[PDB]
RNA sequence: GUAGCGGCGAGCGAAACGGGAAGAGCCCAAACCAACGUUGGGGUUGAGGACAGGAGUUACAAAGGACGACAUUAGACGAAUCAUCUGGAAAGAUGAAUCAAAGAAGGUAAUAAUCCUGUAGUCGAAAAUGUUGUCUCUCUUAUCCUGAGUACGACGGAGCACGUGAAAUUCCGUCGGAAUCUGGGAGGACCAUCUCCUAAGGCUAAAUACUCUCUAGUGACCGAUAGUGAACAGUACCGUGAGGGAAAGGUGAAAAGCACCCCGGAAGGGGAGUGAAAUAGAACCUGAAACCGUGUGCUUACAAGUAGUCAGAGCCCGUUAAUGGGUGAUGGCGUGCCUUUUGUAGAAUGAACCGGCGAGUUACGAUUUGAUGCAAGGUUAAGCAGUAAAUGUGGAGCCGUAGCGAAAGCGAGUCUGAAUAGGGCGUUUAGUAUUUGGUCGUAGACCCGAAACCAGGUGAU
RNA sequence: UAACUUGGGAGUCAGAACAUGGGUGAUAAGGUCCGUGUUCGAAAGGGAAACAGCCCAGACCACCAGCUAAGGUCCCAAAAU
RNA sequence: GACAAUGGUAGGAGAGCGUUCUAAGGGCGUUGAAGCAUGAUCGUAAGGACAUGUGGAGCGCUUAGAAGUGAGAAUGCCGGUG
């Protein structure tokens, strides 16, 4: 028998366009350039999930070296001093140490010079 | 091997012995399925058919100059992709039967009753006595030998006052021995066959 | 349609139990004064159509049994 | 088994493969056929045994023999098909082909020496295998030809 | 797809036997008689002829009537249901019944065996048309000859599966040109024997081919870009002409198709009515997308960009209640897609956008794999019966059980060979039928596209 | 931890750079033709500003965890003024 | 439970999603089917539900069978509209 086109072409092509909502003029309203976006879409999401890592970690670095400054000590050499005294504390609670209690963090670099001389 | 024989006002008038090389098999549901669907297959016409680039009228000239226009190239109004224009491929008349060895033919056939005898799906009547069509009466007849609602009814020739009386009866289709096949028996949820037809049947099959 | 005979090819092979195809030897029509005694004798006896052949050439001799 | 419950038997069926229907089935767009070239056209290839044009082997090797129009072809029996027959039976064409072991009787029977005959016969056939003669009279039996 | 034909290439490709459908045989010319060369009689072949009631208008000769039959072309009868509920409407649901040789189908305000038209079954023809049976009606009771410009032959061609070849067999043109039952022809050059037949006159039903039609039906065929080109057309339109050739279906159950009032010249509207519904009001079922507008929650006039993505305050909301939705200051990262390419952001190709349509199919063969039945066996084809079925029957045929050899042949071997030699191919079981999948072959063979070629026409407005 | 044999199904027959052994050219070419290896092709990720073919390294998916490679640590811009 | 493997073009192999039709079974529907629209829903993907609006008469599910069975590109064809 005959099998007309019928309606999945408009339900798949819907499909694309819903998820194409909140982009530019046409590329949330032709189906051809939501495609296309929304295959860029995906692409760029399955980097930046593995990019979003790296930027975190850049953070927390750069405000423990600014806390660690603050006792005049560089970020390398309190990082290495941590290691030595046996410290395992990442990066991100050394931040939040850094920002939210500030004696606690000056403990840390007490432990941190004191394993290092 | 041994099977009761009722009668039609649902009392035992006797028994009977059929062999067991006939209603006694394992059904083979491999054999059986393929018949099935070689007799389905049989049963389709297969006039379908659709108008190919050739077929379709007119379209002999070429529509515009290969090249200078800007347009491409067309070589028929009715080529596949015009609006109008010839089918590719699809639909076209042929039949869909195909044929079987016949001893796998056989080894449905018996699979098919031995299943039937299996599932308690196997009633023998003493005779069918029916000197004039009446469908009320085969209802009752039916009502009687506490019959489902799929029956296939088997007599051992052309029985025409029997034929006469189901043939309206939803549910209830009619054959003789010789008539067996295995979309009616399959579809019957239970089978009403005379003596005489159950010896023709266990003659003719073995 | 039946698939048809490459009758060519039935002139010059012949199917061996095992199912390959006996052939004659190229090289033994003319100019034998060029071609070594040894060399003659040895074109006298018969070969297989090679495994690489066959694979091309199994269609044309379906019917050749 | 009943018509709403069909069953095929396990891998006697098999989805056929549907070319040129989109990337992820493996066969989109090309299709299997690579790109390009003769062999990627409709209708497209050389003719089976067509070597490019390098002389062809079916042309590079020599013709040979005949055809004899009065060949002669025996249907053959050997002798352990004879041995199911009962001692003391008369073999003959006849008995041969009713009891199937000559389908078809071809240009006439003829009696080869393979198996070993266990049961003394007398056979008329029309010809005989020398083995064969030694082996139906060594055990008793006769032949004769027809 | 054998034998054979074939730049022995591409390809082309029988027939007899066997199994079936159907079945039917006959009339002349001639010798020879009767009559006035022409008419009658007679005769019809593989050896015959000369001489010595049963058959019929379907061939075998040809015209008619009587009565009956059937069928076709109009028609007739034809079983059985009520109530409540929801509804605009009941056939739906619910409860209780009935008919059935009728539970095919269509219609009826939604989905009906019992409301209607019908169906099963039965009945029916004034007239005409057929097919037909009986009666009738017709007709019948080796002395001589046996197809002559023939057969046949040469040359040139053609048809035969066959390309002139070892080419028989059939036909045509030109030219030549027999024999006369002790005859003549064929059996694949040709000769002899043998075997079969009897040319050069004619007639013949059936089995077979097709479908513009008609009647009755059918479909794992289309359902308005499909299916006919055409559901409303060979029309509109184009062309001097031959010729080419569209688009275009749907109110509602019922027209109940909007009385009347208001703005307006009208068109068109807002009310009022009809209707279950009028965003069912005729451009009339549903009414997607592109595209065009109106309102506004967040945001935007120091900013450099494939427009997103990840991070993220602020503001506005509140969901299939989910570690929610909308928007988004600001930061990181980031040169569309497809094709074709060594390599394309490419300034190489293609796409304005949206929608619809648009490309490995089927038949018959081959091979392989999986499945299944049977197994030294496996299996039928056409045909017949059957419901366009399954199936039953049909064993002709096909493959296998044995190979080797160019062949004669021999045979678990065989070929080569002088060989008790060596070597090649074989033996020291498993096939076969159907079918799913893969692939190949013949077919247009995945789809679209030339420039051209040929044939028959139409044009000197 | 493969290899070979027998069958079913292919695609491929335009290659490119780099390093190195050579011909050719002019110890020219992002030249051309052979040998050898790698990568690209058909490979994303980090480095070389950008940059198929170079260096590090082969992405099953998720994480706001950790250790390293090439390459780096004054600011852009992570880490030694 | 504990070890390994899982970049990929031509291409080979496997398993699935969805469309129309058929058979059998079992269901839905004027207390509103298909279609359409919206949504913050489910599944590893193709895709599947539910709720609400529109619509006004047909349509799912299960197993099996068959295909005119899936479009984004062909200076593709037709229509509509920029
Ligand atoms: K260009
Ligand atoms: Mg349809
Ligand atoms: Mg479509
Ligand atoms: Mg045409
Ligand atoms: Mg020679
Ligand atoms: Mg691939
Ligand atoms: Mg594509
Ligand atoms: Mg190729
Ligand atoms: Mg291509
Ligand atoms: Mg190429
Ligand atoms: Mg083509
Ligand atoms: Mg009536
Ligand atoms: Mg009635
Ligand atoms: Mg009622
Ligand atoms: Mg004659
Ligand atoms: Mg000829
Ligand atoms: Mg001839
Ligand atoms: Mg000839
Ligand atoms: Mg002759
Ligand atoms: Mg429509
Ligand atoms: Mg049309
Ligand atoms: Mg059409
Ligand atoms: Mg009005
Ligand atoms: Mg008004
Ligand atoms: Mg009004
Ligand atoms: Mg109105
Ligand atoms: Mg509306
Ligand atoms: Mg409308
Ligand atoms: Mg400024
Ligand atoms: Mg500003
Ligand atoms: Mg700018
Ligand atoms: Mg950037
Ligand atoms: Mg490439
Ligand atoms: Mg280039
Ligand atoms: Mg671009
Ligand atoms: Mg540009
Ligand atoms: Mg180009
Ligand atoms: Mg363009
Ligand atoms: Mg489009
Ligand atoms: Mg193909
Ligand atoms: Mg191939
Ligand atoms: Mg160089
Ligand atoms: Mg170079
Ligand atoms: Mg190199
Ligand atoms: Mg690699
Ligand atoms: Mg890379
Ligand atoms: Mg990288
Ligand atoms: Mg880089
Ligand atoms: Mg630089
Ligand atoms: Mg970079
Ligand atoms: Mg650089
Ligand atoms: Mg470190
Ligand atoms: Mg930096
Ligand atoms: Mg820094
Ligand atoms: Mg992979
Ligand atoms: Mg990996
Ligand atoms: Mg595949
Ligand atoms: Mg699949
Ligand atoms: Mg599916
Ligand atoms: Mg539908
Ligand atoms: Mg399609
Ligand atoms: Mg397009
Ligand atoms: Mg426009």
Redesign the interface.
């Known amino acids: 028998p005959r099998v007309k086109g019928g309606t999945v072409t408009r339900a798949r092509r819907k499909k694309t366009i819903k998820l194409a909502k909140g982009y530019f003029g046409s590329k949330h309203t032709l189906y051809k350039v939501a495609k296309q976006q929304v295959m860029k879409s995906g692409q760029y999401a399955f980097r930046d999930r593995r990019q979003r890592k790296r930027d975190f970690r850049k953070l927390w670095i750069t405000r423990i070296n600014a806390a660690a400054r603050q006792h005049e000590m560089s970020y390398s050499r309190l990082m290495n001093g941590l290691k030595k005294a046996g410290i395992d504390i990442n990066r991100k609670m050394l931040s939040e140490i850094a920002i939210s209690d500030e004696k606690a963090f000056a403990q840390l670099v007490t432990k941190a010079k004191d394993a290092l001389k | 091997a041994n099977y009761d024989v009722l009668k039609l006002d649902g009392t035992k008038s006797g028994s009977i012995e059929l062999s067991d090389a006939v209603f006694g098999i394992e059904p083979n549901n491999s054999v059986l399925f393929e018949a099935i669907n070689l007799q389905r297959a049989s049963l389709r016409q297969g006039t379908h058919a659709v108008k190919n680039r050739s077929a379709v009228s007119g379209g002999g000239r070429k529509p515009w100059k290969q090249k200078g226009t800007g347009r491409a190239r067309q070589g028929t109004i009715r080529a596949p992709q015009w609006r109008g224009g010839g089918i590719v491929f699809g639909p076209t008349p042929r039949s869909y039967a195909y044929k079987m060895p016949k001893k796998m033919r056989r080894l449905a056939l018996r699979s098919a009753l031995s299943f039937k005898a299996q599932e308690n799906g196997l009633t023998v009547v003493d005779a069918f006595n029916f000197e004039a069509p009446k469908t009320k009466e085969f209802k009752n007849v039916l009502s009687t030998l506490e019959q489902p609602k799929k029956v296939l009814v088997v007599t051992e020739n052309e029985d025409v006052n029997v034929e006469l009386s189901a043939r309206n009866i939803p549910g209830v289709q009619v054959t003789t021995a010789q008539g067996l096949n295995v979309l009616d028996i399959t579809n019957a949820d239970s089978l009403v066959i005379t003596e005489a037809a159950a010896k023709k049947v266990e003659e003719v099959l073995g | 349609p039946k698939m048809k005979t490459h009758r060519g090819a039935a002139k010059r092979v012949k199917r061996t139990a095992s199912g390959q195809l006996k052939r004659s030897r190229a090289f033994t029509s003319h100019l034998f004064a060029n071609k070594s005694t040894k060399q003659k004798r040895q074109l006298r006896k018969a070969r297989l159509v090679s495994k690489s052949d066959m694979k091309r050439v199994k269609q044309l001799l379906a019917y050749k049994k | ?3 709403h419950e ?4 396990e891998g ?1 069926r098999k989805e056929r493969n549907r070319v040129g229907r989109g990337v992820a089935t493996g066969n989109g767009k090309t299709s299997g056929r690579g790109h390009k070239g003769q062999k990627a056209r409709s209708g497209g290839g050389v003719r ?2 067509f ?1 490019g044009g390098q002389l062809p ?8 023999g005949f055809t004899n129009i009065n060949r002669k072809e025996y249907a053959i029996v050997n002798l352990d098909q004879l041995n199911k027959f009962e001692d003391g039976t008369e073999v003959t064409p006849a008995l041969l082909v009713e009891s199937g072991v000559v389908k078809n009787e071809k240009s006439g029977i003829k009696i080869l020496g393979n198996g070993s005959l266990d049961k003394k016969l007398t056979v008329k056939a029309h010809k005989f295998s020398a083995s064969a003669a030694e082996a139906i009279d060594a055990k008793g039996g006769a032949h004769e030809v027809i």
């Open positions: 088994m009943k018509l069909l069953k095929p038997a006697s089976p045994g070597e082997l079916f042309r590079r090797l020599p013709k040979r």
